[PDB]
Design a protein around this ligand. Structure first.
Ligand SMILES: [Mg+2]
Lengths: 63, 331, 132, 303
RNA sequence: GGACCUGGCGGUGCUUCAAUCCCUCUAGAGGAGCCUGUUCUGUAAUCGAUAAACCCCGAUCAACCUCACCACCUCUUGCUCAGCCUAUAUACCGCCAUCUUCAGCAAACCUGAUGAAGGCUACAAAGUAAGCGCAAGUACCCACGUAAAGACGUUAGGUCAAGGUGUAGCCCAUGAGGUGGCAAGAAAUGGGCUACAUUUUCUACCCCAGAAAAACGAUAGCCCUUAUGAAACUUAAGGGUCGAAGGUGGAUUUAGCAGUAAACUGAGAGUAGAGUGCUUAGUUGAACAGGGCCCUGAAGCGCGUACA
């Protein structure tokens, strides 16, 4: 029953929202572990964009 | 001749002639089960065979062979005719459709709850509303757009394709139930803030509204809002009104909207609400989970928000659309 | 295209039984005979009368048990006896079943001048062998 | 499920005991073959297909393994490669890869089993490319100096690809001879060839030249003995029946060749078999088909 | 009006192809006679079948019957709780044909920023697919071949005269019964049989011979008799008679890849009888099998048309 919209929010966000809605009968196995130890960045989908203007890659060379 | 008679199933097959060269490309009759009301052991002679069409015993006594009187058999025949005609009349009579957006349109018609899921999953709480039906070269099929919603924020939409309309509906709803969003709702009756979005070439401008304001939106938006669980909102659709684009953009905006709690946490401040009905009383709707900022936050003297010309015109009263605010049925 | 004794494919919602699902060419390979007598054997006689009896009995039973027979009727002719085996639904009352059984037994026996027995096997529903 | 299979096992054991009691056979020593015989007798069925007939076997043989669910009660699949979808196939591939690694570190008789054979072995549904991959890996395993410990495993996938010498009987007078038989078209022939003889060949009690007034049939009779260069060294009595003249000649020739096998060396027998003397002819008349004049002669195509 | 997606079409060429498109091997049809079906004429006087996919077809078969036709006569609740072989196969069931000498048809599921739409890469990149069909399995003598099978659709294909049936109409007649009858040939054509011969004719025999040889060649015609049957010019069979056309055949063209073609001989279905028709058994039993694509059709490479 989990929402299959991977481009909307994260797995945690969608599962939490559905549980709050009550559509999800019970929290999946990993939800508690994710909540306790979330990753440094929420796994939200994001389409890569190609730099066009004067913006440059901030990766500095090593010397 | 007895040996020439055929079974009722074959007779009805031949009579209906569903399969045929004409029926191949569309270049009516009803299968009336003549054995429905018949009772075994009943004949025009009205013979009461013990143990078959009458009770075997009587007051503890075995019944014997008897024949109904002429008048009794006539009454039985009349009653059978009455039952047959009542059944035929009840079959003929029809219950009017739960009309949709229009008499001859599929828009808005409710398809009922989605089919139950295999692994003990049920969806009786989800209402399903059609939004669009189209025809679509075959050596023609039907495409459908439907939406489903639990009425408590969890709503989704899907497309279906099938040679048969009913199959298309089934596919569309069974697929929608797997594509649910969760539209956060303010006080469980309206969106959190005004939303202005453009999807493809369809502009959607949705405005929060106080309770009782009702849904003043494009009828498709009304259907979607009812499914989601939004009771009060205003919505203006501009540009191309392609139904699929409208639905997709509406869901995109509603899902992307931002909650008061999220805003409070982001900006590290109390979110305070002011109501005309409550005068100067400040209502702390949401507060940040983290420490609250001691910084009074910038007092932006003049905002840079991109105002809507139509909104400004309406506010200033220059708007005089005869169609705006026309009284309409409860939505 | 062969239209003979075959169930045409459909959307998959058409349940069908063993006999209806097997076509004639498979006869004597996957499905046996619904009537077992010695008339057609080599050097025997009365094939026509056996056929007439089979047709009459089948029509008789079909008309006697409307919407009750869940499978075709198997006829066996041992010696001079006759055995009609049927698969019937558990929809008609047992008393009616027994009365019809006895009546048909006696009437057919008197009609054809030979003992007859009817053997009913009851099922909750017609045995689906596949869906077409 | 496993509990269902266990219940079927118990039921089959009880039915086996019932059958043993019914046939009076000791249930303890009652075997599967005995069960087979008894069931065949007790349920006489005349179906041509061995599958369409009744059966009462062990549930193991009866039921299809149906891949055994693959996940226990907990729901954890048993096979580590389960999620591939071809767990047994990929397990075999992994094993062959490991054997190839081990062999790499250390350093007209048969063929490969067909793809259907391999599919049955793995109780799995493969593809042509899967079979090609497996067979090529196996071939590499051959070429990699596969020792006994590896050749034993390989032979699990290999498939392997002589005329019977009849006994030399003796007459009442003690003269040795060999009897044989052969059939051609509709003819049958029984030939007795004597170890020693002056080339006399009596057919149906008749001299061969008289009985076969055609030099072609005479040549057919002479062919085997000429081939083995034993003309005039054997006396032959041939009883033939049925069919036309050429069929009779062929049947007698086959019978004589088979009978002479017993008297000619094994290399001679092999040479005859290679030539075709000792190979029964499968060419038989093909039945006329309805709607066409001959076995292949389609009626004159109307227009 | 703009930008896109799909289906259709060529009188579209290159490359692959096919008892298999043309040649290649064999045997034949068309040329003569006869059997037989069909069309036109005729008839007071038969329905359907109708390019492949009609044309010894429904018919495993017509002297009456069959029979549904014509002529005449007769009957009226009629064998049938009547009937109708009268229309409607362009309503159907039932049974089939054609591709099919195919292999695809497919429900139900799962990318295009959820548009029409799409779903391929094996050193694999979003497809899985139940089921149906081929296949597999089965009969015959193998594991071969032939049978059998052969899905979805194609031609409003046929069949209302197997029977059932929607629909249409008749009921003193479009229903029912009895007696008699054509079933023919200007002319064409389909299929089959018999020949034109010397590898033949003929006997014996069933393959070691003697005659015939311009005679070969009608199962046709005529007469007679026999079998069937109530009835024989009607059918079949036997004898005599007659010895005709013809001398390997035009447009052209059919079939076959091996126990096959070809030739020959038996048996069975059906009837009282009735085929050169059909079905089936067996015997002797080969030749080519390699080239190409103008012609047919099937593909890929693709090209260019264009409307839905
Ligand atoms: Mg209306």
């Amino acid at each position: 029953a989990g929402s299959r919209l991977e481009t909307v929010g994260s797995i945690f966000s969608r599962t939490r929202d559905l549980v709050r809605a009550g559509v999800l009968k019970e929290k999946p196995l990993w939800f508690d572990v994710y909540d306790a130890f979330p990753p440094l960045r929420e796994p939200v989908f994001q389409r890569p964009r190609v730099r066009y203007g004067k913006a440059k890659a901030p990766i500095q060379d090593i010397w | 001749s007895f040996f020439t008679k055929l079974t009722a199933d074959e007779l009805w097959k031949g009579a209906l002639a569903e399969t045929g060269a004409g029926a191949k490309k569309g270049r009516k009759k009803k299968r009336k089960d003549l054995n429905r009301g018949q009772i075994i052991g009943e004949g025009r002679y009205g013979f009461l065979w013990p143990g078959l069409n009458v009770p075997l015993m009587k007051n503890g006594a075995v019944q014997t062979i008897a024949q109904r009187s002429k008048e009794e058999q006539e009454k039985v025949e009349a009653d059978m005719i009455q039952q047959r005609e009542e059944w035929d009349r009840k079959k003929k009579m029809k219950v009017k459709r739960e009309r949709g957006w229009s008499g001859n349109s599929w828009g808005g018609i409710s398809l009922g709850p989605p089919d139950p899921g295999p692994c003990g999953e049920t969806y009786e709480d989800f209402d399903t509303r059609i939004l669009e039906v189209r025809n679509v070269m075959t050596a023609k099929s039907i495409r459908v757009l439907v939406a489903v919603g639990n009425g408590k924020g969890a709503a989704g939409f899907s497309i279906g394709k099938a040679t048969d309309r009913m199959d298309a509906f089934r596919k569309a709803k069974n697929r929608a139930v797997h594509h649910l969003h969760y539209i956060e709702r303010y006080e469980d009756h309206t969106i959190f803030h005004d939303i202005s979005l453009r999807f493809k070439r369809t502009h959607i401008k949705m405005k929060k509204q106080p309770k009782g304001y009702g849904l003043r939106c494009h009828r498709a938006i009304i259907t979607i809002c009812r499914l989601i669980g939004i009771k009060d909102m205003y919505a203006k659709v501009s540009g191309s009104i392609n139904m699929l684009s409208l639905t997709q953009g509406l869901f995109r905006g509603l899902s992307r909207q931002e909650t008061h709690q999220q805003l409070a946490d982001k900006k590290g401040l109390h979110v305070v609400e002011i109501r005309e009905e409550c005068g100067p009383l400040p209502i702390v709707v949401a507060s940040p989970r983290g420490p609250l900022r001691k910084d009074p936050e910038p007092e932006d003297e003049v905002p840079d928000v991109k105002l809507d010309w139509e909104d400004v015109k309406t506010a200033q009263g220059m708007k005089r659309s005869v169609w705006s605010n026309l009284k309409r049925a409860a939505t | 295209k062969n239209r003979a004794a075959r169930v045409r494919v459909s959307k998959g919602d058409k349940p069908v039984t063993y006999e209806e699902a097997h076509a004639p060419h498979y006869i004597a390979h996957r499905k046996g005979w619904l009537s077992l007598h010695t008339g057609n054997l080599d050097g025997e006689d009365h094939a026509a009368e056996r056929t007439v009896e089979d047709v009459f009995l089948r029509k008789f039973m079909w008309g006697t048990f409307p919407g009750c027979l869940a499978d075709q009727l198997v006829l066996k002719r041992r010696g001079n006896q006759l055995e009609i085996c049927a698969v019937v639904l558990r929809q008609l009352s047992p008393h009616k079943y027994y009365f019809l059984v006895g009546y048909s037994e006696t009437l057919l026996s008197y009609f054809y001048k030979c003992p007859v027995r009817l053997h009913l096997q009851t099922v909750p529903s017609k045995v689906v062998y596949k869906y077409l | 499920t496993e509990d269902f299979i266990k219940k079927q096992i118990e039921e089959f054991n009880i039915g086996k005991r019932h059958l043993a009691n019914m046939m009076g056979e000791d249930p303890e020593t009652f075997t599967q073959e005995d069960i087979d015989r008894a069931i065949a007798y007790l349920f006489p069925s005349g179906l041509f297909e061995k599958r369409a007939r009744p059966v009462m076997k062990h549930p193991e043989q009866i039921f299809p393994r149906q891949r055994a669910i693959q996940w226990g009660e907990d729901g954890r699949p048993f096979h580590y490669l389960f999620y591939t979808g071809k767990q047994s196939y990929y397990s075999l591939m992994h094993d062959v890869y490991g054997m190839l690694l081990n062999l790499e570190k250390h350093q007209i008789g048969s063929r490969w089993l067909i793809k259907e054979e391999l599919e049955e072995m793995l109780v799995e549904k493969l593809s042509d490319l899967d079979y090609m991959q497996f067979i090529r890996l196996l071939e590499k395993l051959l070429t990699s100096q596969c020792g006994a410990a590896e050749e034993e495993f390989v032979q699990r996938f290999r498939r392997s690809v002589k005329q019977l010498i009849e006994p030399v009987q003796y007459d009442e007078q003690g003269m040795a001879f060999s009897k044989s038989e052969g059939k051609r078209k509709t003819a049958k022939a029984e030939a007795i060839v004597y170890k020693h003889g002056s080339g006399r060949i009596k057919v149906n009690g008749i001299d061969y030249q008289l009985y076969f007034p055609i030099t072609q049939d005479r040549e057919q009779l002479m062919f085997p003995f000429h081939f083995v260069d034993r003309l005039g060294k054997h006396d032959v009595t041939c009883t033939v029946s049925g069919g036309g003249r050429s069929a009779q000649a062929g049947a007698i020739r086959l019978a004589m060749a088979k009978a002479l096998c017993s008297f000619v060396t094994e290399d001679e027998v092999e040479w005859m078999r290679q030539a075709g003397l000792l190979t029964t002819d499968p060419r038989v008349r093909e039945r006329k088909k309805p709607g066409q004049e001959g076995a292949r002669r389609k009626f004159t195509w109307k227009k």
